[PDB]
Design a protein around this ligand. Structure first.
Ligand SMILES: [Mg+2]
Ligand SMILES: [Mg+2]
Ligand SMILES: [Mg+2]
Ligand SMILES: [Mg+2]
Ligand SMILES: [Mg+2]
Ligand SMILES: [Mg+2]
Ligand SMILES: [Mg+2]
Ligand SMILES: [Mg+2]
Ligand SMILES: [Mg+2]
Ligand SMILES: [Mg+2]
Ligand SMILES: [Mg+2]
Ligand SMILES: [Mg+2]
Ligand SMILES: [Mg+2]
Ligand SMILES: [Mg+2]
Ligand SMILES: [Mg+2]
Ligand SMILES: [Mg+2]
Ligand SMILES: [Mg+2]
Ligand SMILES: [Mg+2]
Ligand SMILES: [Mg+2]
Ligand SMILES: [Mg+2]
Ligand SMILES: [Mg+2]
Ligand SMILES: [Mg+2]
Ligand SMILES: [Mg+2]
Ligand SMILES: [Mg+2]
Ligand SMILES: [Mg+2]
Ligand SMILES: [Mg+2]
Ligand SMILES: [Mg+2]
Ligand SMILES: [Mg+2]
Ligand SMILES: [Mg+2]
Ligand SMILES: [Mg+2]
Ligand SMILES: [Mg+2]
Ligand SMILES: [Mg+2]
Ligand SMILES: [Mg+2]
Ligand SMILES: [Mg+2]
Ligand SMILES: [Mg+2]
Lengths: 117, 113, 127, 57
RNA sequence: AAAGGUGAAAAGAACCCCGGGAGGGGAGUGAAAGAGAACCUGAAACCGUGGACUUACAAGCAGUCAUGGCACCUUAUGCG
RNA sequence: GCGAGAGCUAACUUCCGUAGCCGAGAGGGAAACAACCCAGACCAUCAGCUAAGGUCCCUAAAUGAUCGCUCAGUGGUUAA
RNA sequence: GUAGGGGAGCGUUCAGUCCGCGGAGAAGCCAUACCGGAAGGAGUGGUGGAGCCGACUGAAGUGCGGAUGCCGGCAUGAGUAACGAUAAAAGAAGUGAGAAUCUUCUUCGCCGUAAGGACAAGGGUUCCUGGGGAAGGGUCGUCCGCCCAGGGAAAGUCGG
């Protein structure tokens, strides 16, 4: 017996192509360039899962430093200050305190510069 | 660049045989239909030729006869029309824009006395 | 309605103010150049502009315009003094193909394309 | 010799190029007599009027 | 060399509308003309019309991640 | 890199010995950069500590401390 | 983790058997935010108009992006080059649904040991009449060496 392709190739193809909507020009309409674009997309996805974990830490840190310095303290000195007084806060959380709740962040500042004295 | 006249994608002899044929024709029948341009280019050659024929002497006939090679038309422009234009300081003709043709897209036009 | 077949019996589709010239031996992009002037415009206007547009295509398109008019008036009892070109477009017919010789032995293929002109008339009140 | 294009031109490009092929619709006036339409400084092709009446019928 | 397919049955569309015609819109037949003779399905490339959000200080393998704006609500008011 | 020959104690040179890496190695650093420095990625996380390398702004992190040096932009490429 | 070795599977036709669907609508096609560790798999809806899914087992012409691969369709270059001798055209008139291109008239221009006339070779109805206009004509055609029909070719002495 013989077994043509029948139906499989087009299903594969549409699969790729349908992953690829919103891609510019032929990248979203031609199979091969879709499939290709997608390989590179692979790289970018995996990488950036790790990397976004890298990025958000960064952000938190920025905000923290800011709040720190509003009340006359560097960030680094603020964080040894916190570790000294064994306050054990996430910097995600430290950021959110710093940004959202003024007086509270203030209190943590005073506690930390005390731990520094 | 103050030069004057139209090349009309033709050689000097052609250019001449043109203005002569179309002069002969306009004078043979009071009004003709032709490219708007060829009209523009015809008006002052014919108007002048009229002013020549407006002399009436034999010189002015022989003159006209060089440009207009058909006896009957010469005789017409000498004896019939020039004498009519008698009192008009030139402007012996006028031009009308009919408009676009089918084959080649060209604004035709009408020229008459 | 319960069945597709049921609908296919009960309704019958209508093409209200619509005519189509199929297989016009012209090129779409050309014909479009003309059509884009006609479109949105109030049928009378279209009738005129088509008489003073100096493309060839202008003529087949004139003809479809009139066919859609005579379909909105007759087969649809619509109101002339309220008709406008609701939509119009050109798509590609089966394109004629012919060999043409070239220099040395080479040959080539001219595509005498073809065209489907479509106009759709429709009444316009503002309210 | 024999230049040739390096790369297919995108549908997008090609069409950006075409941004100027818009035909210009006639400015059209309505004949002061027989009433259809005409071009400025041309003879009204319906009647034949240009003030009195020049082209024929 | 390429070449295949109306419909169960030709009942193959009388007649009316625009057009020289081509083509089409009706009507009538048919279960269906979402089968009309360029007639089974009719994918993709490719060409267009319309609508959503968008773009005229911009350096780009066109993705990917994060967030904000708008829009939308049939495995859909959230993980969207 | 270290050990030699060949070579001009030239070569991103050639031919051997030896360790490591690339090859078949992603991740951080060295602006960029197979090889160098840190380091071997089973997957998920908007969690914590570190390595080399860094903490004026682009750019995460002391415009840190104390005792000096250089004033030449040396810093930010060579010699008698 | 490259060559390579090993392991467990996904999907495709055909085949046997079991289950079983299908005009209150099959396969195929189309959309989709659901499912599975992946090949993949279902739900619903639109299409279509007569066949087909699931399970176990068997056999393969069994899975594609590459091969300046093969066949086919359609893009780009692009409304670009070009429209095939620089011998040349103008008006009127007619026709016609439509004419710069067809017909008539008047001229103009170009060949004239030729671009005129008559044979041969070759071609094969291309000749004449009447009609036609899809394509062929490098535009357009109402015209044609194109399409349809009907006519036309006569030898004791020319050639065999
Ligand atoms: Mg980390
Ligand atoms: Mg020219
Ligand atoms: Mg018909
Ligand atoms: Mg019925
Ligand atoms: Mg749009
Ligand atoms: Mg600026
Ligand atoms: Mg802007
Ligand atoms: Mg070497
Ligand atoms: Mg590496
Ligand atoms: Mg690296
Ligand atoms: Mg870097
Ligand atoms: Mg290197
Ligand atoms: Mg350190
Ligand atoms: Mg900083
Ligand atoms: Mg492995
Ligand atoms: Mg079976
Ligand atoms: Mg089957
Ligand atoms: Mg291929
Ligand atoms: Mg090639
Ligand atoms: Mg090919
Ligand atoms: Mg152009
Ligand atoms: Mg060009
Ligand atoms: Mg050019
Ligand atoms: Mg040119
Ligand atoms: Mg020619
Ligand atoms: Mg010429
Ligand atoms: Mg008539
Ligand atoms: Mg000619
Ligand atoms: Mg006559
Ligand atoms: Mg001869
Ligand atoms: Mg014979
Ligand atoms: Mg033609
Ligand atoms: Mg006729
Ligand atoms: Mg003949
Ligand atoms: Mg005899």
């Amino acid at each position: 017996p013989r077994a043509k392709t029948g139906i499989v190739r087009r299903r594969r193809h549409k699969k790729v192509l349908k992953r690829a909507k919103g891609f510019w020009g032929s990248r979203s309409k031609q199979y091969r360039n879709a499939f290709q674009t997608l390989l590179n997309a692979a790289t970018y996805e995996y990488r950036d899962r790790r990397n976004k974990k890298r990025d958000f830490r960064r952000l938190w840190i920025q905000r923290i430093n800011a709040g720190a310095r509003l009340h006359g303290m560097n960030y680094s000195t603020f964080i040894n200050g916190l570790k000294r007084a064994n306050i054990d806060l996430n910097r995600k959380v430290l950021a959110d305190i710093a940004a959202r709740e003024p007086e509270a962040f203030k209190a943590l500042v005073d506690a930390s510069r005390n731990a520094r004295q | 660049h103050g030069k004057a006249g139209r090349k009309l994608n033709r050689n000097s002899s052609a250019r001449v045989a043109l203005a002569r044929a179309q002069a002969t024709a306009l004078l043979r029948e009071g009004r003709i239909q032709t490219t708007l341009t060829k009209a523009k280019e015809l008006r002052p050659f014919v108007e002048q030729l009229i002013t020549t024929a407006k002399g009436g002497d034999l010189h002015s006939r022989r003159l006209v006869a060089q440009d207009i090679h058909d006896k009957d038309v010469v005789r017409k422009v000498m004896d019939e029309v020039a004498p009519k234009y008698a009192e008009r300081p030139g402007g012996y003709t006028r031009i009308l824009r009919v408009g676009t043709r089918r084959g080649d897209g060209v604004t035709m036009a009408l020229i008459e006395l | 309605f319960r069945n597709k077949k049921q609908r296919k019996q009960q309704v019958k589709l209508r093409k209200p103010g619509f005519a189509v010239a199929k297989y016009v031996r012209m090129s779409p992009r050309k014909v479009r150049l003309v059509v884009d002037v006609i479109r949105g415009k109030s049928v009378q206007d279209a009738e005129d502009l088509l008489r003073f547009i100096p493309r060839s295509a202008s003529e087949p398109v004139a003809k479809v315009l009139n066919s859609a008019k005579a379909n909105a008036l007759h087969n649809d009892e619509m109101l002339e003094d309220r008709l406008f070109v609701k939509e119009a477009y050109v798509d590609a017919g089966p394109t004629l193909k012919r060999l043409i010789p070239r220099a040395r032995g080479s040959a080539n293929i001219i595509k005498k394309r073809t065209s489907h002109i479509t106009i759709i008339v429709a009444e316009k009140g503002n309210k | 010799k024999h230049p040739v294009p390096k790369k297919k031109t995108s549908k997008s490009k090609r069409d950006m190029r075409r941004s100027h092929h818009a035909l210009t619709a006639p400015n059209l006036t309505e004949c002061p007599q027989c009433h259809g339409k005409k071009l400025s400084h041309h003879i009204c092709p319906n009647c034949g009027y240009y003030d009195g009446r020049q082209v024929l019928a």
